[PDB]
Amino acid sequence: CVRDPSNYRDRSADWYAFYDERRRKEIIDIIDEHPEIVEEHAANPFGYRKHPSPYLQRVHNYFRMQPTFGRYYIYSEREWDAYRIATIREFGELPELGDERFKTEEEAMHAVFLRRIEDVRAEL
């Protein structure tokens, strides 16, 4: 019989843990085997008139689909003057802003990319 809904959990989350483990290991292997994509992203983070390499694209495809609880974005103190990196929190909560300010949004985007690579290295 099935009578108490607290006896049961979403057992797909076990596979989500397994999948994220293997997927993080693959991503740091990609960053170690092609170290020039970091400077490629530093030179042009939008890919404007020079589209990304497929390995930089594969790293982007890992980073850009994660859940929003704990995802980074770019706050604007003053537009076209100052940019900070903020972490998404719960509802009713202000974001946790960073410390370093930036001048343009390309610099902030490359710093978010570097901080994401530091966070995926820190968990392993």
Add this chain to the structure above:
Amino acid sequence: CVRDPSNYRDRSADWYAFYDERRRKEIIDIIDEHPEIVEEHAANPFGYRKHPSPYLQRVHNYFRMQPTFGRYYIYSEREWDAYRIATIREFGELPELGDERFKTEEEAMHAVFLRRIEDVRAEL
């Protein structure tokens, strides 16, 4: 007024001609700048337990979506014994088979790949 339907054509085909021209030029530039993907496809044309490189994948994505009128496939004279390369024709027409026979289907697949690269080189 619009009275005679033979005065009008699908004018998107002009862009299809433009698109196919630029797309063929891109594909032969990819085959010239990474010549190891041909031996990568020769070693393992299914990608079984060794997935293709993204440049070999981009060449496959060009080749595999073309219209069926004039597309190659693999005929079987005798299964697991003999394989030939055939060209799709109109309805009611037998295909135009090649000359060389093959032993397994991996050899036939790599020969179809080589013949596709020869055909995209011949049009330029």
Add this chain to the structure above:
Amino acid sequence: MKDIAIRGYCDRPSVATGETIRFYVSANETRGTFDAELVRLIHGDSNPAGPGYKEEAIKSDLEGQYPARFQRTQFGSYVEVADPDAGLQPDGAFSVHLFLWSTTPSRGRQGIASRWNDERQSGWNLAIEDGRVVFTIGDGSGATSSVVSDRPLFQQIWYSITGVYDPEKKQLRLYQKSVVNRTNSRFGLVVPLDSDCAVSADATVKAADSETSLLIAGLGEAAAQDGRTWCIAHYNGKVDAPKIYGCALGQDDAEKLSRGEIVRPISRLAHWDFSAGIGLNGIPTDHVVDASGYGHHGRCMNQPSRGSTGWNWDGHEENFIHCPEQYGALWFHEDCLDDCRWEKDFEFTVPEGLKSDFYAVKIRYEDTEDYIPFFVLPPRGTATAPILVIASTLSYLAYANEQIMHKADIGQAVAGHTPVLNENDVELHKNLSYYGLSTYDGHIDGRGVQYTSWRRPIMNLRPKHRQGFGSIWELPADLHLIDWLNHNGFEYDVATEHDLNDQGAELLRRYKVVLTGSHPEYQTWANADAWEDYLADGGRGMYLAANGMYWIVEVHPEKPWVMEVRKELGVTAWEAPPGEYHYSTNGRRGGRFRGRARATQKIWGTGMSSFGFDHSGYFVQMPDSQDERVAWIMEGIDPEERIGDGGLVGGGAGGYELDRYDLALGTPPNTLLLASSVEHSVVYTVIPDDKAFPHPGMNGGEHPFVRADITYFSTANGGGMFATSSISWLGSLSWNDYDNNVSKMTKNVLNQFIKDEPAPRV
């Protein structure tokens, strides 16, 4: 090259004991005799890595020699109105009005409506030749009179067309007017369309009796011998509300006919309302009603699309059963086929002691060997085994005479490789008129094939067939499971999905465990109800397959060999045009099962997740494999082993189509998750059902939805349900000479499910 020279089919797929099946065979030319005998199919895959082809010959009262003969096939849709008394060839003046929607107006000579003999040019017709609408009468001396329209027809534009013969002035007239509105046509009311004409010509000859039947969307070939009219010049596209008057008409009368107004109700010789008969159960009949009141009733032949959008359809109602006066059209593709109508060559009455299994009739012609597979049921009301195997005949009809690799431009892109094709594929491509099309194909118009039939030679149903995606697809992929059950000691019965549709859960409750074929993509609504009633009360089942309840199907009520499916945006090859989602056979929506709140997870635990056809993967054990509730599944399997790394279908177990666990789609809360498949390539994709916005990276190994999932859950009264969620599970059973993880796991579950103890509460 190797030429196919003999064909054939059954009247019906499944036959119990005592009752009779008929076999209708054709050769290329009438000469010689063919041999025939009965075999029991055991195995079909002839891969040298496997067991190879296996069959058994059965002594029967069937074998002998029979005269080989060519049997002609009528191919394409039309409505036939039988008129033996020449009531629809008027002696004086007459006028023919209909609405028109042409999809290939420049494809040769196409007859719209006629009582026309074409061997001798006699009668009258209304036809499209050289792109224009032409009205022609004829006497039989060969010399005819025609009137030809001025403005050529635009494609998929609704036109009102009146053809008038007036002997009082000896004058043929042809009135043409376009009736486009905001919704009915290809383009809208914004174009400055000038395609109306009123032309006239001289009538030299008089129209004579053609001794044929009146046809809609076709021309009669020759004089009607044996009470049968052959149709040749097939029209493509909708025809709405045709009518013959016994008087001549003027331009004001055609102007009022163009607005949908029935002028002169006393002068109608016949008036066929194609929407007459639409109730709340759709329109499941071929009877075309003469609404004039003269008993000139017609008959739809080769199944045109009943319940289609007419000329006056605005988009305020999209169900045809609720607004039937706007759904009065009929589509008439030129390559429809529901029955070959051939003549019987022999028959077979099932003996008292023939085991219920897969069977075929091996036709031995000159240098050509053809089979005709059928199924033997256990006797009516009995069950001679504890295991039932449901043969997936609805999905056999959906893939019947499948021609994706010759017709679809994205055929090679969905598979991960250049396809390999047999001589059956080049014979389908060369003789299309003898075979028909698949539901994964399109017509010559562009619209997908809705109706598929059993009474035709289905060339990919034979067990020696190999398919374009890779190895083998429908019936030999089920002979994998048949060979595995025969190699072990299991005793099984075989039913089909037409039988399950006929019998409900009464068929299923006779058995301890019911297994499922390799790929049951298509199910009816009643089959899903029967499975849910079976599992709900103590029943046990295995789902050794993927994509297992995707499209809703209805079998035609008058014609149990015809099957309808209408598709939409999903894992599809086509989509139905806007107002035409509702089935003719029952007036219900019936798209995919997930869109009707009956997802496949809600019965079988897992459901469609991903597809892709280059190679297969292997399962890795999840932490629930080491749970002690399911130690009976994982008995002789080490907890560090891969599962199904190697196989005959693709090269692994988890592959070619995958199903996943999802509580939100209806997976039961006590389902355990035993394993999951990894190493899927970039050609495996997220199905469109699970996407909000397509962003990059919806691929294998880049998105969490691309996986398979081996699950188990138990139901009440000692039931249970086990799924492996992969097409290529059954192609991995006979690997390493039956010594692998797949056969040990499936044998563990099948030994537990046949015991008298209840299935373990998990």
Add this chain to the structure above:
Amino acid sequence: MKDIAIRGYCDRPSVATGETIRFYVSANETRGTFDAELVRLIHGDSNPAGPGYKEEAIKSDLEGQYPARFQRTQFGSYVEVADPDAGLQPDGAFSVHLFLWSTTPSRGRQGIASRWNDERQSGWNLAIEDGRVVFTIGDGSGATSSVVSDRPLFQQIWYSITGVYDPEKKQLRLYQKSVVNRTNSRFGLVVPLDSDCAVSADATVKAADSETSLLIAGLGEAAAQDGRTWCIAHYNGKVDAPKIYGCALGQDDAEKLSRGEIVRPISRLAHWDFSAGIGLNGIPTDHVVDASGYGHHGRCMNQPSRGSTGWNWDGHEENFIHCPEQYGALWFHEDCLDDCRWEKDFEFTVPEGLKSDFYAVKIRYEDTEDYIPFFVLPPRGTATAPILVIASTLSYLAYANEQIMHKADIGQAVAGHTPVLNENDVELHKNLSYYGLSTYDGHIDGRGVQYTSWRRPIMNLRPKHRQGFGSIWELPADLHLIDWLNHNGFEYDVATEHDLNDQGAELLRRYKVVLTGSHPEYQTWANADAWEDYLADGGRGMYLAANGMYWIVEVHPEKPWVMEVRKELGVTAWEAPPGEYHYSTNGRRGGRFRGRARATQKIWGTGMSSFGFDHSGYFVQMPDSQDERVAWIMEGIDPEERIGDGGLVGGGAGGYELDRYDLALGTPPNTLLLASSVEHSVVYTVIPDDKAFPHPGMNGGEHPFVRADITYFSTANGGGMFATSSISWLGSLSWNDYDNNVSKMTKNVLNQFIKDEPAPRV
């Protein structure tokens, strides 16, 4: 950080001369005064590569100082039944029955039905607290009596619930039973669900009058002052057919109530049939009918989903107007909002000499500057200009308070970059109760937001707002075109889409040329009819935009500020649940326009092809640019130049969303194809409407469908239509100080379309 401290909205978007608009402003706390004045918006993009922010102050009778005050907002759906005479607080025994479908059964304390004061614990309620259903009475002394169910509720499972108070035994009883069938719930009939209970408790206190109104899906906060009850404890999920009896019930009576049978019709104190009122025009009213016959009529507040699947829904009918007895539910999300119901602060009557343009009211609080944009129309029946600019207010409401980047996990993947957000985005994320949600969001349940409203502060409608995809999205992206028209010498009027819905093509025919905003993604059916009637008879228009007629919209008939949209598989953020595709406001299907045979090509020449948000492209001239019929478009443009290589929105002209030429979707046969856009990245994708099977490579520069197309065609009576098929066209006008190909092309076409000569034929 920079904190928003002042808010506000209008009663209505568009106002002609003579008539009055009202402005409802709120501060964080009641102190101080705010300043206000009227500005004319000219430009909104503050990119240093562009012209920068531009406005003009207008002397008006509006300006002054006004007292700043905090205004409370009721937030979430409920049905309110006003009862001043305490008729629904019975003096003796009573019983409450309803059906239940809970989507968040473990999210705090949630009231289902009540006449309950919560400041003093008096009245009765039926509520979900700590995951279980609890029936509680109270007198006002704080000491209450509760009965608590045994079995906790499963999520999205239909339950029948009876709560009985019986003073004859001083006993509270609670009957609970699950009513799952094959289609109504999350899982099906295969699980062994045991969730029925009959419990009982002791009643110590008696239920007293609470001096509130009876509520459905909520608890009343305090005593009803000023005739208004505040609702606090909001329930999430469907409630079907509630009823109060004036007698006590037994278990047999609850067993018959569970099967949908109305027991004891004389004892009903009230009985609310939520499906009473469903005609063939849907149910476009908030009136909830008491079907018992006592005049206790209710009212839907904050717009719950009318016309939803009930407990007895099997999937045989999916339109709610044809089977209304199975569509009797009501969804009640906790974060619905259609009106803030605030009190007016000031108003504005439009003077006689105010030009029809974009306007805003600049609120100047302490250190916070807020605007409230509105639109001034020309006077009723007149037109003071040759150019009309349709402001895209329906698509402003669809994107109102859009929170994709905080709520959607695929927000960063659709854009090609990490998003940059303002303080408006963190104030939406922190104070959600003051603002509401967008139609691109979901509720806390999971289902998308259908209804969106104007009477709320919309934080991304202000011109200094920048959006997460990149630069700027809805209203400043239209101020690009406004600034370009003001920089040249053109004289224009401004209308909205609510005005076009009200007025039809009579509004459009007053003008020589009608321009279109940057992104008109949402249109009603009547707006499409008005545009087709305008272009069909000599009208001229520019489509300077993409995705221009995608989703079908209906404005609510009783509430012209509320807009409904229901979505499906397409370019979507959500899909409607299975039986719920048909609109409440009119009982019609209304999904996307392409699925109703009204594709955007059929009117405007091009329609939706691709989307993607990292950067933009440039146009390359097709061979029809050198045609001599369109030398008036390509006048001062060299035939080897790129078009729009550089701009403010994305960095080019063809970008952010693209439309293509397609005759099969309804593009007129005489359409010329001038140019097409190249250099699109891999983040640009094929929309799901154009896919059969997803294979790899449906990307930019790898598939032919990913492009934009600049087209022109002419209609009858000297009309014409010109499309540029790109969102980022208007962001490339002011590039290089208005000296570029985009401004020269758009200026050529706009100078030709305002002449008295007819537009040149094709």
